[PDB]
Design a binder for this molecule. Sequence first.
Ligand SMILES: Nc1nc2c(ncn2[C@@H]2O[C@H](COP(=O)(O)OP(=O)(O)O)[C@@H](O)[C@H]2O)c(=O)[nH]1
Length: 157
Amino acid sequence: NDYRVAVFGAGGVGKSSLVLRFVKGTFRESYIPTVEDYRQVISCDKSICTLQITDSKNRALQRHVIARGHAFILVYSITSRQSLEELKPIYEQICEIKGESIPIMLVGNKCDESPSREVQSSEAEALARTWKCAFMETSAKLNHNVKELFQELLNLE
Ligand SMILES: Nc1nc2c(ncn2[C@@H]2O[C@H](COP(=O)(O)OP(=O)(O)O)[C@@H](O)[C@H]2O)c(=O)[nH]1
């Protein structure tokens, strides 16, 4: 019943906003400039066993999080192609450290703002095909397939 995830993405894309809505079902909109931030670690000891999740965005502890981790989420904002570009160094960083059989997921969060949609799902799906990983578009605000994401991550055993 142990279940450990790892969430990656640029600042502000909504890693903790997705994890916080999968663990506690809550969401509360906020804004704060990146100069003030992010990094969160939320792990609630269930009852049967455990459920531990981490969001990462000087010190290169990303190497430690990846080496110790065993299932990764890559989050980019639909309204930011730059944030999608920042995930490729993280993918290569998870490939050099580990092995292929790793369960990886590419998430297009903040899909509720198609008026600001910079990344069309075509460009992203091609990348998911070339990475041999799964891709889906979530929205922590409106709870669009947020549970359907972590469920698909829990299945991969
Ligand atoms: N409109 C909208 N805003 C979102 C969504 N997900 C996250 N946000 C906003 O993004 C802000 C910062 O996200 P955060 O999780 O702190 O960034 P991260 O921890 O670096 O991944 C939050 O205050 C949310 O209001 C979404 O699906 N839709």
